[PDB]
Symmetry: D2
C-alpha cells in the first residue's frame, strides 16, 4: 500500500517488493516454516523482485475458515447493502489507477498503455456487478389448485479462484466481482509469477467496508491450488489456465461434487475475406496477436486470408509488426515488453524453431532480442513474429503458443475455411472481416466458439458474457449470465390447503 | 409397439418381452456377438421378462454417429419448427397413456395408480419444453461509441443421459424434453433393470417427425455408461444415480471437458412442528417415504417431530403404514408393489436388521412378506417400515436406504432441528409442517437443500426447477432454468466503424 | 359453422350468410328491436352477403357481464391448465384452415394465397401464447434485514378489442391469444364491414374448453365501440385503426383510467441504396405496397431510391406492377382482389386524381378496372399504381392512402434521406436495402419507427414484438413483451420480524 | 446552492428564498413579464418564503427545446457512460444530505426524521437506475429459414413529469432516475406550493456532468401543466396527483398520442385479523396513517379490525395517536408538523366535521391546534385523528382525505372483509396482519391493489415496482419493470437471403 503510493517516482529496474504476500483475516501474514520459496521476476530486466512463500494445508484451511466467517455476515446483507460497499471499492481503485497500473507493469511485463486499460476494466467490472446486486432475484409462479412456488437466488458459500499471470489484477477482479455481488466470500491464488497486485485488490475491498476476511489471498503453485480443489468447505472453484491443468482441476473437484467453471486457452481463427476493408483487417490481425506480448487466451493466432488479397495483406502486416517498439514497458510509446519468464520465452522460441523445421516461413521476428537500453539487457525479450507457408497439420497451427507468433494461411472459399477453422478441440474465440451483411452474420453463426468479433478483434465489454466452447472450458465471466455461476436457485413449494395423500 | 398395443388384455405374470431393445438410426437393432446378457425381471412375480444385451464401444459409437447426423438437421430448425414436432409427440403419449403405464408397472413394479401420474408427467414435460422452444433467445446490447453486441443461444450437440430405474419412462422424458427443445440430439441408456419403456419414447419421437436418428437408446451397465462419458463426440452427459457413481462420471467426463449435470440421492429431512395440522403432517410423512416402494430420491427419510406431539404422530403414522395394501401393482387398490430386484430387497432388509443391532426400535414392518395371491410368491416384497428410538449417529439415519423405511426422531427447538437437519453432505430436498407464516419461510430459507416443501411433500411441478445442493449434485430439470444446461451463449461483438489499434 | 363446413363447394358470387353474428354466453344472439342494420359486401362482386345488426348499450353490457363470469373461472386456472385449452383451439383452426381462409376471402376480398398465410398466423399466435402461459411469473427478491418481497403476475379482467377490416380473423386472434394466456376474458368488435369470421374464432375457443362466456363478439360501428370504451367493468381497450379514431378512443378511455394500447396507421419509408441487390429491392418494394390490395398498416409507401439506380429500379418496378393479376381472389394465380368497399375505392381513386393535380406523374394504374369475368363486374377493382415525380410536400407523400399506390422519390445522401424519412408524425415501420453491414444497422438505428426490415419487407414473425412509435400508437402485439400489456404486477412485501415504527 | 450551504445555521421561521426558480439551458432564469405570482409558504409558521412565477407557452417551449438538444447528446452515450454521471449525482446528494433535508422540511412541513429518509431514498433511486443502465438490452432471436431478428431498447425523447407536493425532492428523483438511465431528457414541474428543492436536483445533475439542458424545471399550476401535456415535441408525460386531474392529463395527452403513466391517490384498506401480534398491528396502523401529516398516497385509511380484538386495538391506537408530538418539524423528537397549506388544513377539518354529522365518532384529534411555541402560532396545525363507528357508505370512508384521519371499522369474516375492501374504484395499496401462512398469502392474492404489505405497512424498497390498479392509475416507479415505461423496443428483421415475393 505504501509501495503503491510510491509508484509515481518508480521506474523500470528500481523496485524491490518487501511486503508479506499471504493475506487472510483482513491482514498480511508473516511467512514462517522456512518453506522453500520461489523467485518473482521483473520481466523487462530479469531482476528478482521478491521471493514467493507458498501455502500448505494449514495455511489454506486458515484462509477458508476466515472466508466462511465473513460469508456468514455478507450473505445476510441485501443486494443494495452489498452494492454500496462494492461501489466504494471501485471508487478507490479509480483514485489509485495510475499507481496500480505501474506496479502491474513491473511484475507482469506488459506496457503501461495496456495496463491502464486493464485497471480500468477491473474497476468497471466491480461497478457493473455492484449495479446488478439489487436486481438479483428468483421467481414467483402460480400453480394448479391454489398452490404457489417461489425460487430464492442464494449464494454458494466460499468460492476459490485460481488465476493466470497474463492479466493479474483484472482477472482477480473478474472473479471477485460476480462472486461478491451474489453474496459469496472468496479465497483466490495468484499465479506464483505474479503474486503482488492481487493483495492490493483484497486490501481495497477491506478499506471499502467488506466484513473482515471476505476476500483472502493464498500464494503458491500446483499443490496450493490442489488443496483449494480438495478443501471440503469450499463450495465452488473457478479456474483460468491451460487445458491439461483445467482437466485435473475438474477431476480433483469431483471428489466433493464442487461447482466448477473453466476458462482454458485457444487456437482462435480470424477469417479475412477479399471484400474486407484492408487497413481494418490489418489492424484486427495485429490486435488479435500482439497485445501483452502475445500472451492472451483469445488471440486469433490462425489468420486465414482469402488468396486474392494475401500478398497485399502480408506486405502491410509484416511492415507493421517490424515497426512494433519493443523495450521499456513504462514508456508510453513502447508497444511490447518482455515475456513473463525465461522458460516461457524459451518455449515460445522453441515453437518458432520447430515451425521452421516443419517447413514454415519466418517473414519477421521469432528471435531473442536485446534492446539498446542497458538496464533491459537481461529482460525476457523477443521480436514479434509472423509465419507464412503454414499448414493445418503443423505443430504451430495446432498448438496454443502463447507468445507473439501469428500463423497466416491462404483459403479459397467460405465452406472450406469454416471447416478448417472449426477442425479443432479448442473453441474460445474467433473473428471475421467482411463487408457483406449476410456473410458476416452467417460466418459468425457457423464458427464454433464462445465469441466472434465482426470487423474488429479483442474487444472486452463488461456488459456481455465471455467463455469457451468445447475444450476451451465452460462457465462465463462478465455480462448478466455470469451471476448464475455464483448463485443457486432454491425451489420453495407452498401448499395453501390440505395435503393430497395416497396414504 | 405391438407389445404396447396388447397391454389392455395383459396382467401380472402374463407378459414376456421379445423385442430388440437397442435402438439407433430410427430402428431396433438385432443383437449379435453373443455378448454376455443379463436377466430383466418382473418385480411382483420374480419371472424373467427377457435378457438385456449390453452395448460395447462399437455400438455406442454407432449410436453417437446417428445422433450427430440428425443433430445437423434439427439444429437448423427454428424454435417454432421444433415445437410442432414435440407437440405431436406429447399427443401420441397422451393417446397411449394407459397402455404405456401398464407396461411400465410390469418392468418396474410400482402401482398403476402411481404409474399413470408418471406417464402424464412425461407428456406434460415434453409439452412444456415445446412451449419454451419458440421463446429461446439471447440479448442485444448497445455498447460505448456505436458498437453493439448480441448473444445467440445455441445447442450443445449430442447429449448423453444415463438414467435410473425408479421412474424409467418419466426420467427418459425429463432429459429428452429440454435437450430437444434447445436443438440437441440425444443418446440415452436406461438402467439395465428397466430397459423396455425407454425405446417406446424413442419410437414415438420418430413417429412425431424428428429427423431420423435424433433420439437413440443404448442398453448396458457401468461399461456402457463409461463409453458414453469417454466418447469424444458427446458434448454433455446428464446422470441420475448414486453419489459414488456420480463422482466417477464427473471424473471420466473431465477427460474431454464435458458439460456435466448430476442428480444424486439424498437423506432429506422433514420437520414437523407442534403447531402443525397433525393429519396433514401424517399424510406428508407417508407421502415422503412410501411412494414407489420407498425408492425415491427426494424422500424425507429423516422425520423430525417436535417432542410434545410425537406420541400422537407415531400412533397414527404406524396405523396408516400397516394399513398399506402390498400386492399386485396392476390392481387399483394396491398401494405398494415389490421392490425392483432381489439384491435391492436384501440390502434394504439388511439396513433394518442393522438398525435393530445399533439400537433402533422397529414399530412395524421391516420384514420379508409373501402376499396371499399365489402368482406373487416369488416377488420382491417386504412390509413398509417405521423405525423409532433413532440417533443422528446411526447408520440408518445417515445413509440413503432406498426402500420403505421411515426413521423418526424427536426434537425440542427450531435452532436445534435446523442444525441436525443440515449436518449432512446430502442436500436434495426437505420439508416443513407448521402454521406460523414467519416460521415456515424462515425454516425453508435456512434448510440447505435444492427443494423445500411447505405443508406438503412430493409435489413435482414441471413449472419450476429441480436439482441438488452440496453432494446431491448440480444442474436442474424442469422449469425455465434447465434450458441453460442444454444450450450455450455465443457472444458476437460488432464494430460499426474503424478498429481501435495500438499497432 | 355449417357455413364453414360448406366452403369446399363455395365460389365467388355464390355465398349468402344467414347466421346471427352477435355472440355472448357461448351462443349466437337472435337480433331484435329492428335496429337499423347495415349491408355487408363481397368485394369481388359487389353483392350483399347479409346485414349487420349493431349493438346498443344493453347488448354491450350483456357481453361484458358474460365475460366477467367466465373470467372468475379462467383466472383461477394455472398457466399449464390454460395452455392445454389454447393448444386444442389452435389444433381446431389448423384442421379447418382451408375452409376458414375461403370464407375470409369472400368477405374481405384478399386472395386465398394471402388468406392461407393469415389463418396460419392466427393459429401459430394462439399456439405461441399457450406456450408462454406456464412461463408467466413475477419475482422473488431478498430485502435488507430479513424481509422479502414477491411480485404476482395477474390478469387485468375483461379486455375489449376494437378491430380493423384488413386482417379480420388474424387480428381477432392476435388480441385474443395474449389476453387469454394471461388469464383475462375478452369482448371484441369486428369492423362492421367484416363481421363474420370473428364469431368462428369465438366458437372454436368454446369447443376447445374455455369457460362459457370467456370470448364474446359484439357487432356495430362507432357507437358500439364507444360503449366498450366507456363501460365501467372493462379493464383495458386494445384498438387498431386510424389516428383520429385512436385519439378519441384514448380520450373516452380516460374517464375510467383504462389500460389502452393503440396500433394506428403509417407512412412508412423504404430506403434503397445504390449498393443493393436490385431484384431483391424490387421484390421488397412490391411486397411493401401491394399485399391485400394496398390496405396494410406497415406498407412502405414512400420509396426512396438513390438517384443513380432510380431509372433501372422504376423500369422493373412498373413492369412488375402492371403484371399483377387482378381478378377473382379464390383463384390461386390471382394476386390482387377488390378493395374492401366502394367508398374506400373512391377515396383511394380521389388520392391519385389529387396527386396528378399537385404535379405527380402516374407511371401505371391508378384507375377503375373491370375484369373480364362477368361475375366480377360490380366488384371494387382498380389497377395497382406507381407514382413518380413526387415531393415531400405533396398530399400523397404525407397522408396514409390505404390503397395500392407507391410513391417513389429520389435521394442523394444517407444523411439527407434519413431526415426526410423521419420528418413525419407517423412511425410504424420502415425498411432498408443495402449490402454494407454498418450502413444496414446504422440506418435501422436512426430510423424512427417500431419496426425496420433489413433487405426484405412485410415479414411478421410471432416470436418478436410489433407496434408503433410516435403517432402510430403504443403497446405491442406478438413476442414476449406483449404479455406485459395484458397482465399487471402486484408487489407483496413481507415483514419477517416486528414492525419498524415512528409511533 | 448558497441557500443549501447555509442550512446548518438555519431554523424554523428564519429562512427567506431569493433565488430564481425557473431553470433551463443549465441555468436559473430571471422572471419577467410580471406574470401574476403566487405565495409559497412555510407550513410550521405560515410565513411567505418567496413568490412562485409561473411559466407560459413561450417558457415551456424554451425548456423543451433545451431538453431536446441535450437529448441528442445523452442518447448517444452508452449505458456505462450514463451510469458514471448518474453515480456522481448520487454521490453529491449523499454529501449534501442533511442540508437538502432541512430545506425540504422548511417548504413542505414534514419532520426532519422523515425528510432524511426521503433524501436517502432519492440518492438510492439514482444509484439503482445508474446500476441498471449498462444492463439495458433487447433480444436476439433466430427465425425460420436463416433469417434473424433483434430488438433495440431505445429512449423515448423529452419526458415531462408533473409532480406532487408531499415528497418534493424524492418524487423529482423517482421520475428523473429511470428517465435518465434509459437515455431520455427531462422537463419537470414541481407543485407550485413546493417549487424550491426541485431545482437543486437539476443543478446537481449538471454538476455531475449531464449534457447542458438535460434536466429542466418549469414552475406553475394547471395551465403550465397543460402546456406540457399539449406540447408537440414532448414524447411522454408522467403524472402524480389526484384522480380528476389525472383523467384530464390522459385526455390532453391523447391529442398527440403521448405515452402516459398515472400515479393517482387511494383509499387503501388494512386488514387486521384476530390472530395477529397486536403491537405490530398497532404500529402498522399508525405507520399506515400518520407519516407526513397523513398526506401520503398509499395510506391504509380504512382500518378493518376483526370484531373480537377491536376494543384492545382501539385502546392502544388512541393512546398512541394522542401521544404523537406535533410542533417544530426541525426538532428530532417532533413526529408531526403542519399540513401543506391553509386550504388543505380547512378541507381536512371539513371532512372530520362532516364525518361527525354523518354519525362518526371522534375518538381523538380532528381539531385545529396551536402549539406552545410562539413562532408556530400561524402554522397549519391540527391534532391527528382517529374515527370510530364508521360505515362503508360514509363520505370519510369512501373519499381520499389526505390528512391524518384514520377510519376504523369492525368485520367478522375473511370473505366479508375482502368484499368490502375491494368495493371501491381505487386500488393503490393495502395490507394484512395475520399469523397463519395460508391466510396471509391468500388475502394478499385476493386484494385488488398494486401493493400489499404483509405484517407491516409503508415500506418503499427501490428494488421492487410501485403503482396502481384500477382508477389509482397505471405505470410503475422503482424496480426493474419501470424501465419499460421510459424506453421502447424497435424490432429489426434481417433477411439473410433473397426476398420471398408474390409479385
Amino acid at each position: 500500500a505504501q509501495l503503491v503510493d510510491s509508484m509515481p517516482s518508480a521506474s523500470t529496474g528500481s523496485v524491490v517488493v518487501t511486503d508479506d504476500l499471504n493475506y487472510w483475516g483482513g491482514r498480511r501474514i508473516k511467512s514462517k516454516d522456512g518453506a522453500t520459496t520461489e523467485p518473482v521476476f521483473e520481466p523487462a530486466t530479469g531482476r528478482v523482485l521478491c521471493q514467493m512463500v507458498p501455502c500448505g494445508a494449514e495455511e489454506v484451511d486458515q484462509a477458508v475458515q476466515s472466508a466462511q466467517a465473513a460469508y456468514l455476515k455478507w450473505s445476510k446483507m441485501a443486494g443494495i447493502e452489498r452494492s454500496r460497499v462494492m461501489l466504494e471499492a471501485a471508487r478507490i481503485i479509480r483514485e489509485r489507477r495510475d499507481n496500480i497500473a505501474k506496479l502491474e507493469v513491473i511484475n507482469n511485463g506488459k506496457t503501461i498503455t495496456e495496463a491502464e486499460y486493464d485497471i480500468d476494466a477491473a474497476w468497471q467490472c466491480i461497478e457493473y456487478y455492484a449495479g446488478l446486486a439489487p436486481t438479483l432475484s428468483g421467481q414467483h409462479i402460480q400453480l394448479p389448485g391454489g398452490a404457489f412456488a417461489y425460487t430464492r437466488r442464494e449464494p454458494l458459500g466460499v468460492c476459490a479462484g485460481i488465476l493466470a499471470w497474463n492479466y493479474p489484477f483484472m482477472i482477480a477482479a473478474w472473479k471477485c466481482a460476480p462472486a461478491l455481488a451474489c453474496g459469496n466470500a472468496v479465497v483466490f491464488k495468484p499465479s506464483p509469477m505474479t503474486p503482488v497486485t492481487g493483495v492490493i485488490l483484497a486490501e481495497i475491498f477491506h478499506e471499502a467496508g467488506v466484513p473482515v476476511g471476505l476476500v483472502n489471498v493464498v500464494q503458491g503453485g500446483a499443490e496450493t491450488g490442489s488443496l483449494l480443489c480438495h478443501h471440503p468447505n469450499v463450495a465452488k472453484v473457478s479456474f483460468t489456465g491451460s487445458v491439461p491443468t483445467g482437466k485435473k482441476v475438474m477431476e480433483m473437484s469431483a471428489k466433493t461434487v464442487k461447482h466448477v467453471t473453466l476458462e482454458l486457452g485457444g487456437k482462435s481463427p480470424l477469417l479475412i475475406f477479399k471484400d474486407c476493408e484492408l487497413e481494418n483487417a490489418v489492424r484486427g490481425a495485429l490486435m488479435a496477436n500482439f497485445l501483452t506480448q502475445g500472451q492472451v487466451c483469445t488471440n486469433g493466432t490462425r489468420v486465414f486470408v482469402q488468396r486474392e488479397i494475401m500478398p497485399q495483406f502480408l506486405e502491410e502486416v509484416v511492415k507493421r509488426t517490424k515497426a512494433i517498439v519493443v523495450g521499456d514497458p513504462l514508456l508510453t510509446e513502447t508497444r511490447m515488453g518482455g515475456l513473463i519468464s525465461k522458460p516461457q520465452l524459451d518455449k515460445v522460441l522453441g515453437f518458432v524453431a520447430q515451425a521452421k523445421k516443419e517447413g514454415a516461413r519466418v517473414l519477421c521476428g521469432g528471435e531473442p532480442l536485446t534492446p539498446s537500453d542497458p538496464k533491459l539487457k537481461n529482460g525476457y525479450f523477443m521480436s514479434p513474429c509472423v509465419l507464412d507457408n503454414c499448414r493445418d497439420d503443423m505443430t504451430c497451427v495446432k498448438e496454443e503458443i502463447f507468445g507473439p507468433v501469428m500463423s497466416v494461411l491462404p483459403f479459397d472459399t467460405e465452406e472450406e475455411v469454416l471447416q478448417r477453422a472449426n477442425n479443432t478441440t479448442f473453441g474460445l474465440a474467433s473473428g471475421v472481416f467482411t463487408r457483406d451483411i449476410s456473410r458476416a452474420h452467417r460466418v459468425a453463426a457457423n464458427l464454433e466458439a464462445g465469441t466472434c468479433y465482426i470487423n474488429t478483434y479483442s474487444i472486452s465489454p463488461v456488459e456481455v458474457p465471455f467463455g469457451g466452447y468445447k475444450m476451451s472450458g465452460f462457465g462465463r465471466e462478465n455480462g448478466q449470465a455470469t451471476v448464475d455461476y455464483y448463485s443457486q436457485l432454491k425451489t420453495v413449494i407452498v401448499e395453501m390447503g390440505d395435503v393430497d395423500s395416497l396414504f
